Each structure stands twice: as structure tokens, then as C-alpha cells.
């Protein structure tokens, strides 16, 4: 009547994605961890743009929309900043936000390519993905136009908006061989073998297994560039643990009050 | 804009992709729908039954 | 009108690849090879470089001044 | 008085100036006037082409190059 | 002391047009002209 | 025009409780736990963890309406084991398992880098 002892094994560690495997765990925990990977992951992003002079051809809101989708590295800044909603001051304080500025005006004859590199941030570590591969093209300006504005970044998670979605695409998969029969193939021979399939090329699918629980969940968390993959996993685990702790505290208070 | 290069069209706040062929009355694009009718100078021999004539040679 | 910043389905950044895609297509590479040369595995992110229409050029043709 | 000293081509009236010059050349039955108008129209067209090339030297031209080679 | 500045149609040259005055540019002379962006706090949410 | 904002999915409103206990009258030792501003993330793991415990006769959640941010969890244990302590134990052991999983993942990562 207690929990289990899951095991972890990393198969590929790179600076763009990680492929780890979790064994001896329930399917619900795995799916919840996935949904947390996608939705509930603190990360910094643009959420407040003040446009002062925009003579481009696109809409006034188009600039803000594109700026909202530009990732920002937050390897060691997201854990320090606090949510703007829970701040105890006025105006976007640097202790709970990061300021940006963009002032580009096409003067020469050739057309400008306003990229993310023009976003001059006040903080050193909070910069768009341009450290170490072109830069995110914002808009194109021509001789006579300009784009002056300044925006602030705040902490948020994907559940609020897609801008705070660090993971590009999580490849969640378990039981490569259709052993638990969770999916019935009308013609198994017509389907290809999964990447993690241990079954030989002769047999189409593994035989049935009545007394068998789902284990060996495969993951392929792919970072967009802002947060590192392993960092994303650690943040997700910490956030889920915090949510459970808060729920436990609320339940204890409710029981004591009754 | 008769046989004018795309350069001028772009400079005249117009696009070369516009099909054209539409009048501008009071700043509104008016188009004339092509109406169809019976061909003239041709003999038609119908057979109207809801009348006193068996055949009618309209022209 | 302009290349999006991220793929609608997946979410991977694709805005910073339009220029590279055009350059690779211009040099010698084809589309089917350039897409996986840039690093686009999933087929959902490959539409952003194939389906996208670059209409910002026509808009820039109507320069306000000079 | 402003247009007297201020030269005509600057900046957005290039098409309008060319149309006016063409209309003047068509209306004028003289030979010297027609030749002068034609030369002015050709000079304006060449200047517009050079300006477009300078502005469209990058991106706007590379895109056309990639499109033609792709087709 | 705001004389309601405008922007010409094709010249894109600033012009000072006051009430009870014709709508024309300071030079050449056209009949089309637009206004300038407001000076208010245009603030959007990148959502 | 009437689209709700994005903070109403996780943030509590003034006066709304995060969790409310309500005893059922049809069968003994059965309470419905109603959670506010949550989704399947925080109910499916608890459902499974409760399923692990043999003393829990019934366990399962639901979503009264997808647009509404609320989930009801119904638990029914043996008469000698109240459902409150069952929920508490499920949360506690789940937290312990997640912490252990995090530690194992961290050590595996630190060993993977040059090792
Ligand atoms: Zn603050
Ligand atoms: Zn995609
Ligand atoms: Zn005028």
C-alpha cells in the first residue's frame, strides 16, 4: 500500500534533446509527467510590449505577436524571478521581470532584416537564442520605415499560453511491441516496427500477456532552445512535487478545520 | 494602366495581380454580369401545348 | 505573409530557418534534402518551409517614401 | 515656387512624372519636343530601374533567382 | 499649441493644416493626406 | 468578446477553496473530494495511487465540464480505514516516489556527462 521504486536510464544526452527511459512506474504518472513537460514548466518570455512608433507594413499587434514567440534562455533566471501576479510592487520591477528594447530604422537603400539580435536586454543572461544558425526574423523594414519599442519579460507556463511552452515535441511511447493489446491492429504485417522494438523482423507483434503492467516508458523531450532538456525535466518534477505538497497542505487544513 | 510594367503599378498603389476590368463609380467596384438570351436571326420551332397552336415558329 | 516563429503543431522555432532554407535551395540542394539538412525530422514542421508564401516582398514593394 | 527649384523625380511621383511626360510627347506634334520627351522618359525609367536594383539588390533579387532556378 | 500636423499622400511630407483651410500639400499640390500616430500609451499584450 | 482569460485555469479566486470534503450518504465510508482550478494532471496520478492501495474499494475522478476547471474524486475504503487518511497517504507516497525519481534522474544525468 505504498509507492514504487522507478529507475531511470539516459540513452542519448545532447544540448538539444534527451532520450531517457523510466521503468517500474504507473502509466498515469508517466502521462502526467508528460503533460507537465508540455504545460506546467516555468520559463521567461515576452508578455508586455509597449510600441511607440511602428511604421512597418504589418499590423501594430503583429509585432507583439511575433515578439511573444521568441524564446529566451532562462537556465538560472527562471528559478529566481517571481510571478508578476504575486509581486508586491508597482511597474515591472527587474526583480520580477526583464526589460527589452528594440530601435531599428532602415536608412540605407537595402532592406533591413530585423532579427532577434536587435533585442537589447538589460540583463546579461536573459537574451534570445543567439549565443552559440540564423536569428529569429521579426520583420523586414525598407528605407523610410522604423520600429521603436520596449518590452518586458515575465515568468509563466504553457497552461497560460503557448509562448511558455519550452518543449517542442515530447515523443512519449511505451510497450513498443503490442503485448498488452492496448491497440488492435487489423493487419499487423502492414505496420512498421517501432524504434524501440526488440522483436525480430520475422514476428509482427509480441504474443499476448494477461498478467502484464505497462513499464519502460520512453521519452524524447526536445528543447526549443530556451531551457535545457534535463533542466526541463527537473523543473517539471519540482513543480509537480510542489503542487502535491500544496494539495496535501490544503487537505490537512481542511481536515483540521472540520 | 494599359500595358504598364509592374514597377509603375506598385508605385501607383496598385498590384499587377489585379484582374481589372471593373468600373469605378463613386469609389465602388462595379462589374457587369454577362446576361444570356436567345440567339437572334435564328428560327425556333417550339411545340407549346398549353395553347391553341400545335407549333410556333418564333424568330 | 511572413514566416512564422514556431510550428503550429509541434512548436519548434522555424522563423530562424527561412533564409537558410532559401540559401540551401539556391546553392545546389533540393527541398527533400534541405529540410532534413536544416534539422526538421517531423513532417508537421516541414510544411512551414513548403507551404509558406512569402508575401512580405509585395508589401515592401509599396515603399512609403523614396 | 517650391516645384520650380525642387527637382521633379523625388520621390514617389516617378510613375506620375513618366505618365505626364508620355502624355506631353503624344500631344506634341513636334519632332524636337517629342525626342526630348522620349529621352527624359527613358532617363526616368533608367533611374527608377537603378533605384529598384539598389533597393532590391538583396532578398528581393535572391528570391527571384531561387524561384527561377526552382521552376 | 497643436496645429494638427498631417502627412501628405505621395510626398509623405509633414504639413500643418488648421481648421477652415484647404486640404493640400505645401509643395506640388495633391488632395490626399493621412494623420500621424497618436501620442497615447499604445501598450499591447503579446498574447 | 466573452472569451475567459488564461489565469482562471490555475489561479484561485477570492472565496473559492482549493479542496472541499463532502461525505456521501448512499454507502458508508465514502467521500467526494472536489478540487478547484486543476485538470487531469493532479487527479489521474492520485487515482492510480489509490488503486494501488488494497484497502480502497473504489477510486475514480471525473470532470463535470471541460470548460469548468473542477474535478470530483470519489473514494471509498473499508470501514476501518477512513478515506481522508487514504488520500493523505497516497499524496505522501506519491511525493516520495517523485522525489526519488528526481534524485535518480539527476544522478544519472551527472554520471552521463563525461562518464
Ligand atoms: Zn516587482
Ligand atoms: Zn511541425
Ligand atoms: Zn499639395
From TrEMBL, chain A:
Ranges for domain DNA-directed RNA polymerase RpoA/D/Rpb3-type: 17-250
Keyword Methyltransferase tagged: no
Region (Disordered), start-end ranges: 191-214
GO cellular component entries: DNA-directed RNA polymerase complex; nucleoplasm
The entry's keywords: DNA-directed RNA polymerase, Metal-binding, Nucleus, Phosphoprotein, Transcription, Zinc
Gene Ontology MF annotations: DNA binding; DNA-directed RNA polymerase activity; protein dimerization activity
Subcellular locations according to the entry: Nucleus
UniProt: Zn(2+) binding residues: 87, 89, 93, 95-96
BP term (GO), one: DNA-templated transcription
Top-rank taxon: Eukaryota
Family: Belongs to the archaeal Rpo3/eukaryotic RPB3 RNA polymerase subunit family.
Task performed by this protein: Core component of RNA polymerase II (Pol II), a DNA-dependent RNA polymerase which synthesizes mRNA precursors and many functional non-coding RNAs using the four ribonucleoside triphosphates as substrates.
The protein's name in its UniProt record: DNA-directed RNA polymerase II subunit RPB3
Species this chain originates from: Sus scrofa
Phylogenetic classification of the source organism: Eukaryota, Metazoa, Chordata, Craniata, Vertebrata
Automatic annotation (TrEMBL), chain B:
Protein's cellular compartments: Nucleus
Recorded family membership: Belongs to the RNA polymerase beta chain family.
Role this protein plays: RNA-dependent RNA polymerase that catalyzes the extension of a non-coding RNA (ncRNA) at the 3'-end using the four ribonucleoside triphosphates as substrates. An internal ncRNA sequence near the 3'-end serves as a template in a single-round Pol II-mediated RNA polymerization reaction. May decrease the stability of ncRNAs that repress Pol II-mediated gene transcription.
Name of the featured protein: DNA-directed RNA polymerase subunit beta
Organism of derivation: Sus scrofa
Lineage, opening ranks: Eukaryota, Metazoa, Chordata, Craniata, Vertebrata
Automatic annotation (TrEMBL), chain E:
Binding site for Zn(2+) 3: 25
GO function terms (MF aspect): DNA binding; DNA-directed RNA polymerase activity; zinc ion binding
Binding site for Zn(2+) 1: 8, 11, 25, 27-28
Protein keywords: DNA-directed RNA polymerase, Metal-binding, Nucleus, Transcription, Zinc, Zinc-finger
Primary localization class, coarse: nucleus
Biological process, per Gene Ontology: transcription by RNA polymerase II
Disulphides: 8-25, 8-28, 11-28, 25-28
UniProt-annotated binding residues for Zn(2+) 5: 27
Binding site for Zn(2+) 6: 30
Compartments where located: Nucleus, Nucleolus
The protein's name in its UniProt record: DNA-directed RNA polymerases I, II, and III subunit RPABC4
Organism per entry: Sus scrofa (Pig)
This protein's encoding gene: POLR2K
Residues of the full protein shown: 12 to 58 of 58
UniProtKB/TrEMBL annotation, chain F:
Keyword Nucleus (UniProt): yes
Gene: POLR2J
Main subcellular localisation: nucleus
A cellular component annotation (GO) from this entry: RNA polymerase II, core complex
Entry's family note: Belongs to the archaeal Rpo11/eukaryotic RPB11/RPC19 RNA polymerase subunit family.
Domain DNA-directed RNA polymerase RBP11-like dimerisation: residue ranges: 31-103
Coiled-coil residue spans: none
Entries under PANTHER family matching the protein: DNA-DIRECTED RNA POLYMERASE I,II,III, DNA-DIRECTED RNA POLYMERASE II SUBUNIT RPB11
GO biological process, one term: transcription by RNA polymerase II
InterPro entries given in the database record: RBP11 (IPR037685), RBP11-like (IPR036603), RBP11-like_dimer (IPR009025), RNA_pol_Rpb11_13-16kDa_CS (IPR008193), Rpo11-like (IPR022905)
UniProt keyword NADP, yes or no: no
Organism of this sequence: Sus scrofa
Keywords for this protein: DNA-directed RNA polymerase, Nucleus, Transcription
An MF annotation (GO) of this entry: DNA binding
Pfam families: RNA_pol_L_2
SUPFAM superfamilies listed in its UniProt record: RBP11-like subunits of RNA polymerase
Name this protein carries in UniProt: RNA polymerase II subunit J
Subcellular locations according to the entry: Nucleus
Amino acid at each position: 500500500p505504498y509507492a514504487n521504486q522507478p529507475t531511470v536510464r539516459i540513452t542519448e544526452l545532447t544540448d538539444e534533446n534527451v532520450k531517457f527511459i523510466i521503468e517500474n512506474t504507473d502509466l498515469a504518472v508517466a502521462n502526467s509527467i508528460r503533460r507537465v513537460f508540455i504545460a506546467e514548466v516555468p520559463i521567461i518570455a515576452i508578455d508586455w510590449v509597449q510600441i511607440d512608433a511602428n511604421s512597418s507594413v504589418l499590423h501594430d499587434e503583429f509585432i507583439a505577436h511575433r515578439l511573444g514567440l521568441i524564446p529566451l534562455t532562462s537556465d538560472d533566471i527562471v528559478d529566481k524571478l517571481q510571478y508578476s501576479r504575486d509581486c508586491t510592487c508597482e511597474e515591472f520591477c527587474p526583480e520580477c521581470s526583464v526589460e527589452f528594447t528594440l530601435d531599428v530604422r532602415c536608412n540605407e537603400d537595402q532592406t533591413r532584416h530585423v532579427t532577434s539580435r536587435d533585442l537589447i536586454s538589460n540583463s546579461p543572461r536573459v537574451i534570445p537564442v543567439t549565443s552559440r544558425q540564423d536569428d529569429i526574423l521579426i520583420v523586414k523594414l525598407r528605407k523610410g520605415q522604423e520600429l521603436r519599442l520596449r518590452a518586458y519579460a515575465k515568468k509563466g507556463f504553457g497552461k497560460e499560453h503557448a509562448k511558455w511552452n519550452p518543449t517542442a515535441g515530447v515523443a512519449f511511447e511505451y510497450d513498443p511491441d503490442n503485448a498488452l493489446r492496448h491497440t488492435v491492429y487489423p493487419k499487423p504485417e502492414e505496420w512498421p516496427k517501432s524504434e524501440y522494438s526488440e522483436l525480430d523482423e520475422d514476428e509482427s507483434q509480441a504474443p499476448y500477456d494477461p498478467n502484464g503492467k505497462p513499464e519502460r516508458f520512453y521519452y524524447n523531450v526536445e528543447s526549443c532552445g530556451s531551457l535545457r532538456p534535463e533542466t526541463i525535466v527537473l523543473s517539471a518534477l519540482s513543480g509537480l512535487k510542489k503542487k502535491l505538497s500544496d494539495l496535501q497542505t490544503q487537505l490537512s487544513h481542511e481536515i483540521q478545520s472540520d | 494602366l494599359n500595358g504598364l510594367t509592374d514597377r509603375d503599378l506598385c508605385e501607383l498603389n496598385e498590384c499587377p495581380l489585379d484582374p481589372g476590368g471593373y468600373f469605378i463609380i463613386n469609389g465602388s467596384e462595379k462589374v457587369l454580369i454577362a446576361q444570356e438570351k436567345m440567339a437572334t436571326n435564328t428560327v425556333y420551332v417550339f411545340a407549346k401545348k398549353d395553347s391553341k397552336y400545335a407549333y410556333t415558329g418564333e424568330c | 505573409m511572413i514566416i512564422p516563429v514556431r510550428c503550429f503543431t509541434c512548436g519548434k522555432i522555424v522563423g530562424n530557418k527561412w533564409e537558410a532554407y532559401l540559401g540551401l535551395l539556391q546553392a545546389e540542394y533540393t527541398e527533400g534534402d534541405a529540410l532534413d539538412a536544416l534539422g526538421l525530422k517531423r513532417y508537421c514542421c516541414r510544411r512551414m518551409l513548403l507551404a509558406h508564401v512569402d508575401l512580405i516582398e509585395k508589401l515592401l514593394n509599396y515603399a512609403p517614401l523614396e | 515656387e517650391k516645384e520650380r527649384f525642387r527637382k521633379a523625380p523625388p520621390n514617389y511621383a516617378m510613375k506620375k512624372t513618366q505618365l505626364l511626360k508620355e502624355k506631353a510627347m503624344a500631344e506634341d506634334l513636334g519632332d524636337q519636343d517629342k525626342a526630348k520627351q522620349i529621352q527624359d522618359q527613358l532617363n526616368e525609367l533608367e533611374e527608377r530601374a537603378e533605384a529598384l536594383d539598389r533597393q532590391r539588390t538583396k532578398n528581393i533579387s535572391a528570391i527571384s533567382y531561387i524561384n527561377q532556378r526552382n521552376r | 499649441q497643436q496645429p494638427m500636423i498631417y502627412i501628405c499622400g505621395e510626398c509623405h511630407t509633414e504639413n500643418e493644416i488648421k481648421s477652415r483651410d484647404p486640404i493640400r500639400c505645401r509643395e506640388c499640390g495633391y488632395r490626399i493626406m493621412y494623420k500621424k500616430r497618436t501620442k497615447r500609451l499604445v501598450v499591447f499584450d503579446a498574447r | 468578446m466573452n472569451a475567459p482569460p488564461a489565469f482562471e485555469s490555475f489561479l484561485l479566486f477570492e472565496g473559492e477553496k482549493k479542496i472541499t470534503i463532502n461525505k456521501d450518504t448512499k454507502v458508508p465510508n465514502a467521500c467526494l473530494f472536489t478540487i478547484n482550478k486543476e485538470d487531469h494532471t493532479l487527479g489521474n496520478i492520485i487515482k492510480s495511487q489509490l488503486l494501488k492501495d488494497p484497502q480502497v474499494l473504489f477510486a475514480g475522478y471525473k470532470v463535470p465540464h471541460p470548460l469548468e476547471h473542477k474535478i470530483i474524486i470519489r473514494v471509498q475504503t473499508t470501514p476501518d480505514y477512513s478515506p481522508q487518511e487514504a488520500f493523505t497517504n497516497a499524496i505522501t507516497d506519491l511525493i516520495s516516489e517523485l522525489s526519488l525519481l528526481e534524485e535518480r534522474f539527476r544522478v544519472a544525468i551527472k554520471d552521463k556527462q563525461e562518464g
